[PDB]
Amino acid sequence: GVGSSSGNWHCDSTWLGDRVITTSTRTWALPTYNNHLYKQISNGTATNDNTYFGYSTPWGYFDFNRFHCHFSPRDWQRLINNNWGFRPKRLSFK
């Protein structure tokens, strides 16, 4: 519905036993990229070491591949001062 929220704000970290569940919510803004076009992009001889051929797309993408996207500095302190190791197990994205 137009007048009903489709989700709630979920920023939190729950430490339970040998697990920590970080959840983070952010507000994003997506412009129209490339005027909806796919554009071939290139760079020539710039030195040869920096040449490329590729494509710019009208699509954006979501990146959360940094630890501070999920851990607050205090949560990071909790993690690093008390654990010999950690690893991701599962993720949910909304």
Binding site: S72, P73, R74, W76, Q77, N81
Partner: protein, 105 residues
């Protein structure tokens, strides 16, 4: 609450009293009513174990920035803090308090 700190208990851990039982030296062969004052010189040694279970109050804090934590100094030193020296003497270099995490009032 005890003024030098800690837990005030109406019924604290009981005092554990220990004594070497006196072992008389050889008494005289004729009866003497006087209490014996000649004792075999004696001492005892052993092991003592005390196990205390402590309940913890976990911090449930929404503080964003990192907290103050007790940490050992990273820089090099002649000896490790809270370790023995070259003579085998264990030393505590500083009094470690207990209040490092934070709460709102």
């Amino acid at each position: 609450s005890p003024l030098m700190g800690g837990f005030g208990l109406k019924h604290p851990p009981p005092q554990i009293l220990i004594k070497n039982t006196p072992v008389p030296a050889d008494p005289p062969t004729t009866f003497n009513q006087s209490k014996l004052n000649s004792f075999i010189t004696q001492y005892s040694t052993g092991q003592v174990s005390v196990e205390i279970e402590w309940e913890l109050q976990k911090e449930n804090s929404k503080r964003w920035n990192p907290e103050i934590q007790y940490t050992s100094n990273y820089y090099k030193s002649t000896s490790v803090d809270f370790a023995v020296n070259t003579e085998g003497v264990y030393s505590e270099p500083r009094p470690i308090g207990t209040r490092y995490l934070t709460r709102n009032l």
